Design a protein around this nucleic acid. Structure first.
Lengths: 102, 70, 46, 63, 99
RNA sequence: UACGGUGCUGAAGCAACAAAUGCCCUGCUUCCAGGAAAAGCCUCUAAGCAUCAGGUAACAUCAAAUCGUACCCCAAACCG
RNA sequence: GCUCGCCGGAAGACCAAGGGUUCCUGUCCAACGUUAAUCGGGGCAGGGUGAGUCGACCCCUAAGGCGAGGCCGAAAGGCG
RNA sequence: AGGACCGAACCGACUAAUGUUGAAAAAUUAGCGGAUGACUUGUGGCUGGGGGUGAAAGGCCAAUCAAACCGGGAGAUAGCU
RNA sequence: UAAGGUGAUAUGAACCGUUAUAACCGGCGAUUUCCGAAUGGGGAAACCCAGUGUGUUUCGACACACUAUCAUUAACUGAAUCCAUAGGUUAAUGAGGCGAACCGGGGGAACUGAAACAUCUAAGUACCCCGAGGAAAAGAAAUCAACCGAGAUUCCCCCAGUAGCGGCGAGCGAACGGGGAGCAGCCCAGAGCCUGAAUCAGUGUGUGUGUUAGUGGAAGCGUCUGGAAAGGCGCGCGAUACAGGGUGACAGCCCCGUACACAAAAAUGCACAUGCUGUGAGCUCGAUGAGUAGGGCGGGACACGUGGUAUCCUGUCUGAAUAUGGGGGGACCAUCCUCCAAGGCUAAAUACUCCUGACUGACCGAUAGUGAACCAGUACCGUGAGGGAAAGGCGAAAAGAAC
């Protein structure tokens, strides 16, 4: 619903990973918006005694919800709210306040 | 039920023989039947005799027919 | 003496009879309080 | 094809296709028969359309 | 034979149970299960027009099989209801096994 | 042999003796507090059909109408 | 194995109070068997209890529900 | 023949004894009858407030009801520490 | 509109589909395993079987389609009774079915303030019972006064706590007299002339505008400390935006508001203009439905609780007279007065907030508040009738034992 549209490029700033930047993202209902997977040292589980025993410790669901930044491009995270105008006839795709759309 | 021309009556009140004494006087307990209607027979015709007392200007109908009207 | 609690279906009708509790105005109010207005269920209907 | 796709059709699936469209639930939906690498649960994800023809019949006769 | 009847909901899959081994010898006394709709008349009408295959006698069975999944003591019962149907003498499985 | 069991094969096969709870006995007796109707059992006809219809017989078949049937009792999932 | 028990008008039997699916087994220790715990309907993985004849439908009735029209009824209600 | 004399689980209620700091608002053990019916015996449906059936009770009748286990009157009366 | 989704609280795993029908929101339709309130008859809540059709079958069968009790009205039909009439076989159409409570109907106590309990206060309240709508009840006068006059009803402060009734007990407790709020009239009983002229019940259309989606919506960095600096300072900018609270804390500064500009299908608000099915519009000439009223002896409510006695009430019963007046004058009658002929209609003042909606909070911030934060009227007790809990609450990401 978010008119910023699922190829585009965001950053962490309102948590400790401050600057971790990446594109396309993962979007699902009340999903926590991982940027691109900002995790470093957090375990994985063993519900299988077979050979495949999940050995992970990296990328997994590092939360930083919605997006605190209108899509990076050079500097600045605003204005995010900004609705825009007729481009597709059944939706509208946006960038930020200063630069038409993308 | 009886006087039904003029509809119904059983009004629970007393008769004060020692001040405010609840002895229910007002309950009537007597019944009568049979008189001649406008057509042919000595019909069932219910009264106490009140209904038929009320007949001194009725022409078999102008009160008689309130139960029969609907 | 034979004390007390046990289950049966045929003793129900004049007391615990579910549709008898809709037929009396006595029952009707309590049912509606207990599960129509009061958030809840009964379901023990076999 | 989901039901709204074929509305040009003169007759509903009730003519024979109703059973040819329903039989699998007794013929293939037992253990690993309908599939195991490639199918499973069908009758919601894809195969629901048989049920639309039901209310649609009454729409068409009720007009 | 009719198509407007309770058949299309009255059945489930075949019941695959061991008794197909132990009692099918000179006849095919094969197991099924059936939905909440099942009076015997329905499943009697069923098999030959839904699975192409000719039968003789039919049994319906009130099975009441308790279950629990909620952790806390309880779950459900569902309709459950097994049945037994009768694939005659010798046409056994000779093209498919509907197991 | 799956150590449960079925796979092959297979005997022997009469007369009495004593006694029910039970069968015969809505038999048959003995006594009064005096043991409830429709019905299956079996026939009579009213009307009305009456060169039509009805039922009783040999044989061929069909339908055989939602249940419940798991553990449990002169007595622990009743109750206590 | 080997020596004997208890219920002895057996907790022998199948099935009726609707409690309802918690038997064989495959597996076990809290959600509990005031020792052990291997067993308790414990409690969890399968499944199950195959009724045209069993019996309550009926046709039906002695008790007693409801009941035309009613005799009455304060609204209630009662006796058919 | 008989509400026999003496007989079984279907009956109760005699004083103890291990019943009272309960196995039990009740029941008990080696003991003992009324031996066919002034017995009791169990699915239900009439008796639903100041009750209603009489071996005729002040016992009943939820287990201790001279009226409760009602909750609505009502957080009453209150010469009350 | 804008993209994801498969209503979840094991999510494994199938699989719609990010083109403009995947879901999902919304006008309006449409779905039945059977019950069903359920209604053929039966009823032990989930029903066990009547009685008659129809499309059609691999010709077994099959899914289905309807009726009842009443209240009124046309048709056919019908008894002991020539005749009357009841009563059936139907046709038509709706309510009977359901609510915490409001209000209309009546009933409704027991004991206890009174230091004694048969008045009465208790209480018109418990309930149970009958209505039928969103507003009522009412309301167009024998109403009130003194000859002044007022006008449906009564309402608001008074007068007044005045009159005024008593185990002379405790309570109940009036109208006038003044200011006002008010501020308007008629049809049958029926005939002539007149005649879609006034209203409104409907039901299509349409403007002026609603209901809500779709349209939207504010400003910041540098540094000293530093998990988050969203503190502090700088003011490097801001204001009819500085609610509360979100984002791991404390952000005017990022927010989600507020303030403001555009705006839909297709029913349908209300207001009006039209459209059409039905109504009544304008003027006269006519007309007046008494067992009702009396009262002697009953039961009563009124300010007047037992009495000389007061109506408008109610009941066995008896039983008048048309406005050339008497019905009654808060004792009773004068002088005199005012309603009015006993059919029927009325604008305002009032009250239920079913629930959801906008604002306020010397109000509850779980000793609690609508029984109610819950998913607690749910469960721990119950011949039970159903009395209802002990009870707020991990907290960047479930980041929930990698090793």
């Amino acid at each position: 619903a978010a008119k910023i549209r699922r190829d585009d490029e965001v950053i962490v700033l309102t948590g400790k990973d401050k600057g971790k930047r990446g594109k396309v993202k993962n979007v699902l209902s009340s999903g926590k918006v991982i940027v691109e997977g900002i995790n470093l040292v957090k375990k994985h589980q063993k519900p299988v005694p077979a050979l495949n025993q999940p050995g992970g410790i990296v990328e997994k669901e590092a939360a930083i919800q919605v997006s605190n930044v209108a899509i990076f491009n050079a500097a600045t995270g605003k204005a995010d709210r900004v609705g825009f105008r007729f481009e597709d006839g059944k939706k509208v795709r946006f960038f930020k306040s200063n630069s038409e759309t993308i | 039920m009886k006087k039904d021309i003029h509809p119904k009556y059983e009004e629970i009140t007393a008769s004060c023989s020692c001040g405010n004494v609840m002895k229910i006087r007002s309950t009537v307990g007597h019944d009568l039947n049979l008189d001649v209607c406008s057509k042919c027979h000595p019909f069932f015709t219910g009264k106490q005799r009140d209904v038929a007392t009320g007949g001194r200007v009725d022409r078999f109908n102008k009160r008689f027919n309130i139960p029969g009207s609907k | 003496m034979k004390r007390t609690f046990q289950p049966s279906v045929l003793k129900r009708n004049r007391s615990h009879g579910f549709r008898a509790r809709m037929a009396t105005k006595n029952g009707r109010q309590v049912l509606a309080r207990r599960r129509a207005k009061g958030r809840a269920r009964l379901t023990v209907s076999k | 094809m989901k039901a709204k796709e074929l509305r040009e059709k003169s007759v509903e699936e009730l003519n024979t296709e109703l059973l040819n469209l329903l039989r699998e639930q007794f013929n293939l939906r037992m253990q690993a028969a309908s599939g195991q690498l490639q199918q499973s649960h069908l009758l919601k994800q894809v195969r629901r359309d048989v049920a639309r023809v039901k209310t649609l019949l009454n729409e068409k006769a009720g007009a | 034979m009719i198509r407007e009847e309770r058949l299309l909901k009255v059945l489930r899959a075949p019941h695959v149970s061991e008794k197909a081994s132990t009692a099918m010898e000179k006849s095919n006394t094969i197991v099924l299960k059936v939905a909440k709709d099942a009076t015997k008349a329905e499943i009697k009408a069923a098999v030959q027009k839904l699975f192409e295959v000719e039968v003789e006698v039919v049994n319906t069975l009130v099975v009441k099989g308790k279950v629990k999944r909620h952790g806390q003591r309880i779950g459900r019962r569902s309709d459950w209801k097994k049945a037994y149907v009768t694939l005659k003498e010798g046409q056994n499985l000779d093209f498919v096994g509907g197991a």
